[PDB]
Design an enzyme around this catalytic site. Sequence first.
Site: not given
Ligand SMILES: [Fe+3]
Ligand SMILES: [Fe+3]
Lengths: 225, 225, 564, 564
Positions: C135, C137, C218, C220, C222, C247, C273, C321, C333, C357
């Site tokens: 992982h 980036h 990947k 993702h 996004d 993800h 993750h 983000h 929680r 990550d």
């Molecule tokens: Fe991710």
């Molecule tokens: Fe990542």
Amino acid sequence: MKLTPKEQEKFLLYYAGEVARKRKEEGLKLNQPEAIAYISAHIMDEARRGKKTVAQLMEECVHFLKKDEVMPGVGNMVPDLGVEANFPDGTKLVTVNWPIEPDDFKAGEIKFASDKDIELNAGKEITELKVTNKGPKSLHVGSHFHFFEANRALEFDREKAYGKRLDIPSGNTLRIGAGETKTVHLIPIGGSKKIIGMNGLLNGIADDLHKQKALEKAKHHGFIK
Amino acid sequence: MKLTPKEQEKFLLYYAGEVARKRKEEGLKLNQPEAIAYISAHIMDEARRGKKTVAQLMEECVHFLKKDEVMPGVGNMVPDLGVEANFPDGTKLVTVNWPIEPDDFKAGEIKFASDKDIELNAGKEITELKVTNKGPKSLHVGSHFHFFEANRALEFDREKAYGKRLDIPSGNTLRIGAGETKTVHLIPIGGSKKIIGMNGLLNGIADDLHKQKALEKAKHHGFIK
Amino acid sequence: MKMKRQEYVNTYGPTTGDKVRLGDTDLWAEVEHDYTVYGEELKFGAGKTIREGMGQSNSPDENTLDLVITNALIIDYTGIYKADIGIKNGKIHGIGKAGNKDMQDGVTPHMVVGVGTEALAGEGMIITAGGIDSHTHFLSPQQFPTALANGVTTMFGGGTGPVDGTNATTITPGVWNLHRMLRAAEEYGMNVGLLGKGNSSSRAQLVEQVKAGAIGFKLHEDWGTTPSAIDHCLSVADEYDVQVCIHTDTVNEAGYVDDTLRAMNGRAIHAYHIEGAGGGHSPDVITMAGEVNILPSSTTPTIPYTINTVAEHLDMLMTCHHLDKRIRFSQSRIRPGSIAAEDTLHDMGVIAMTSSDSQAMGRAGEVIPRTWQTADKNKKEFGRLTEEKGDNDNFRIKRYISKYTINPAITHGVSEYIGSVEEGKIADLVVWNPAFFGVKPKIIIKGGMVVFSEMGDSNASVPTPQPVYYREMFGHHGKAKFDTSITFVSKVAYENGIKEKLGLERKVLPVKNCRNVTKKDFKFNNTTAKITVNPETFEVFVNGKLCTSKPATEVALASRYTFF
Amino acid sequence: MKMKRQEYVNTYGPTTGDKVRLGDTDLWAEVEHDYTVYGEELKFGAGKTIREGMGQSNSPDENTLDLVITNALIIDYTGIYKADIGIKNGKIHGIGKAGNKDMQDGVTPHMVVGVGTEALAGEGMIITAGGIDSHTHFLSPQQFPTALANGVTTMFGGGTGPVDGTNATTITPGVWNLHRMLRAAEEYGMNVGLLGKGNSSSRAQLVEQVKAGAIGFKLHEDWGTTPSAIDHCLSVADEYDVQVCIHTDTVNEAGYVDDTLRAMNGRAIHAYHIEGAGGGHSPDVITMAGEVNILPSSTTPTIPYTINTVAEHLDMLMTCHHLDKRIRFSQSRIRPGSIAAEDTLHDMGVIAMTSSDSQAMGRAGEVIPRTWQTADKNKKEFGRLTEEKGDNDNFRIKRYISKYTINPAITHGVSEYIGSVEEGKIADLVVWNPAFFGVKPKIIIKGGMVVFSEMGDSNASVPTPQPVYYREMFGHHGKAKFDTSITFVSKVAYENGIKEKLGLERKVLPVKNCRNVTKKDFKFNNTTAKITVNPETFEVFVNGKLCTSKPATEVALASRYTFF
Ligand SMILES: [Fe+3]
Ligand SMILES: [Fe+3]
Ligand SMILES: [Fe+3]
Ligand SMILES: [Fe+3]
């Protein structure tokens, strides 16, 4: 200024020492890198003052940091420290053995299976041999050297050392001082006993067939008197 | 020492913090990089002392530097600060929102043409629709997602959502909590309405011709009960 | 002759039955076997063993080693044992007893120490395979020295650099960007493999990417991780033997976790993750870890679970983000339940990998320390595993080492080249001093050459004087880096001459056998269960039994070793 | 479910602890280990295991085997165990448990049975490596089918055809003859390697031969085995990494045995027919076998020692050497002593190899039967070896199999390619039915293809109808023979493109690591001793004790199996 790449390194080391000093003043127990930098900066300071010898500093820096001045296990982690510094007579290496006082904690601690000794070269037949260094200078002979081919200064029954090596830990050497007499323990060489090199007395298998030829070469080259 | 490239970076940051501290003691108003380094060094110090939590520090560092302790516009230039430091539990990120108190000066200040609202998706026909998240977990739906293809947990007249999207700002999402009922405002999708992907209920133009086929696929896949 | 036990250990390192403490943790590695013949051990130095016609052969041999790592303590999924390691042609030629059969007993036949052999003293050191960070980036080239300095030699992921898409996702999208990055890779010492944009409901755009050199895809959120996108991506990956990394849809927009699992259809997928703090279906993404087809990994910030983990996250999520300060909580929680479970699931062998990550909600030079910190934390909370045989933590060690070495290699289809200390594999190895195991490595070997190491003053009379810091070695430079480094590609790209076509001078190797890797294929982390999350309490249950752990107040391999 | 032991054995062959009688001998092979998972065993047939999506995988794999030998009982120096053997790209890809990981437990990862896999049922069969005959006279091309029909796949020696020089010596002399023979070799299925004339006191003439492709040199008394020739030959052999074979000075013209041994100077040499009937220093040639540098073989006519051995020789010597009928005896007093000792020396692991001396005082298709006849004879005479662990002959079996498989391979520098049933080696294997072990093989596999086998009526409705006789298979024909057969050459020749230059289509491989092979390098036959011969009684002494055996009145693997 004309700062050399080595001078640029020393600034970082010295600044790290200064940060460590600040943290000790705050009452914090120093960690591995902090302790090393703290001692290094002291050595660098004393060298600039040019009043202490390398010998003086090596002695002065033993337990420079005490066990309670550092975190546990720090002392054991740093058994020795080395720092090059410019003295009035030039750059010299300051070597400190035990710069940080150790404690009961040890990172990377090895716990033995038993306290019993390790029988090295097990089952090999030991040959006791009296050797005398008749030469003017002391000499050493390694664990895997063909004993028969040792410095002609050594006086012993060479025939009895043919195809044998010292029954000592691998990598160790036996010292025979100038004029000194010792009883050595010899064991037969492992594997095929293909002895190539050293003094070139054999250059082949150490069998009975090669023995007379080897003894003649040893006599001719002055190993056997 | 075994200094990692990240440790070498932190020494520079810490030294910059120390220079900034000196300048503040001289009574100078700190600039943008000085202010950042001054706060960073404080965070690095507290983390080494290992007595404060990340939560404590994030709170403690808001307005750590006051408007009169820095040059004008410095606070607005630094709306947030982040510094990774080693704590007893390891390296943790300390995130401070408003570390420097702002003032009336703003570098890069945007002055609006008018204070009047911007009419987004102007002239598009709004469709009011009652939606209920009958699922056990809350969900969000983005501005450009084909509403008709939303999580089967959502209960609504799917026929009325065919070829439509949420009339919300581009990039925003609408939340429908577990058990929550909401009135959504839907507008027809822009361009050609060539809906390819998502839940594959359509995969083509959202015209009248494709509608019955799409409603049958939605029913078959469990979107329409 | 009889040698005192303490003297033997000082000279040659530990032997059969000895226990080594890993760093400052409470983990003990026991020497399972010793491949030596007592008295025939290799030692390098003046008057020592490795000398002309003695320990070093004068007889030419086809198996004359290029390098010998004498008296190493191997720690690998294959075992924790004592042996000499022999390197030849940048590969692990042999493991056993090295030396000269002409003068020594019990020499491994293909482990000849000769004129062309270099010596590296491993006596008292731990030798492990180089870590693989699945992982990555590709955000900053500065991640590479940080990674090497922490025992990582291979990096899989994606990116273009400091752009919003990379900041968020492990994606190098499209043909042009993939070509550009594969060419940029030439610079480095690190082994690389790039992932393309898996988020597509069209075949053509996915195929283009595999043919451009991608090792996988990947998916993702996004870019929208919808059930259509999931199916299309896996379909192409199945055709081209490449891996898929995911993800998941955090906000359950197109469906819930079960809807995503259904879209996958039992196909091999790498779930990044798995715990869900870094992203994925809230609050049940962790439930995926129980499934056989799901190959799960954990990112560094949540492992181990500490008293500062939750606090750090409830803000670290806002910087990554770019969220409004109006947003306070839900994560307060949801997060404790999953983060706590994550540690226990690692100890149980449910989560098979650990990754980083890097600069995208995780730390580049923390995979290795954090794995051992978790292993240690778990040993401290739940005691020595029931699986152990003896007064040692060998099984737990093997379970944890597999997480960043062999298991990522299996997942990405490079297990035949790298991932473990085995004969025939590429010599990507790390030398560790036991006091610094898992925190600070000594030497990094890549392709049989030293590429990176801890080094003192460049002017200095010896390599020990201060300041000792990590520096690039000869293997990382010139044209030697092309000999020691690998750029992994797809089979299609490899077979179509991507190396020649892009003028890559580095070793180009294809990824193979990605599609039929299940949980059963892993080493020491093959555990499958029925993982459930209470939607009200957020508590994790393994086969109906609560899965949890207590947060650590302090961790091993941290405070003692680092300045800042 | 519980399966009756008899039913299990009928279906899958023997398992751990079962004992197999080798042919009609009194030798028992015990299954040391079984690599299977009970219930997951592979069986081929209608409704059986190896079927689409069941035992045969539907998932593509990089390791899909080309052939699977299911439930084989391997008999090799490496062990006597039960396993599935996987062939891929004409090499032993894996040994363990083959099948489909999708549907089966405990499958060896690189042993995938898939769409491209062919099935060979080895259940209840013995699988051994193909034998290596290191004493071939290339006198007649008709020796090759005879050799294959007796489990021999590789032949080292020399010759030019049925001329007087080849009738006497294993020599292909000079550049032209070497080129001619290497090109003639293209015809055959047999792996070959040629020896040049070593009997030279001049460098140039020896070098020419190695450069022409010779794998070594044969020194034979018929061309003058003088101390000058012994030294010159070994000097060139040492420079070019090639093997030397020796038939010593029988009539002690230039010196005695000790003078020959002295000329050798501890250098590696393959001493042919060590006992001395086939030739060599009378009566003490056998004394050489005790020496570490001497790699000793035995030729078939003297092994095992029978009631007809001496009578047959006192005339077989007269036809081969073409001696006057005026010559009656010396051989009648000398011969019993050494022939008897020879058998005992084999059992003791003093003589490391068995060979033929094919049509030059020895039989082509007798190496394998005669080795087992001797093993059987000594087990009947000297009992079950003290070395045995259990109610089996495994150690003796391993000692004897090594004589015609691994030990000749080590001697001739081809141990990396052939000689044993090991992963990565060329798939030169023989399938035996236990009732016919050592006497009549079933299938001969060379380079992963069947090259020769016992086959019935060509018209017949099945392959079993009479007459069942040995026939050439597809692997032995067309261009497939170039894929399954090897012509071994020197490194110098290989590296200088001998293959291209002579237009050889066969696989051309170099011999390597010949010069540093001593007795210590062998498998199960590393025994060195002080061997002496009484010059009056001709009795052989091993370290002062008498070395003898009784002559056999009948031998195993003979009368029950052959018509004539
Ligand atoms: Fe991710
Ligand atoms: Fe990542
Ligand atoms: Fe002969
Ligand atoms: Fe012959």
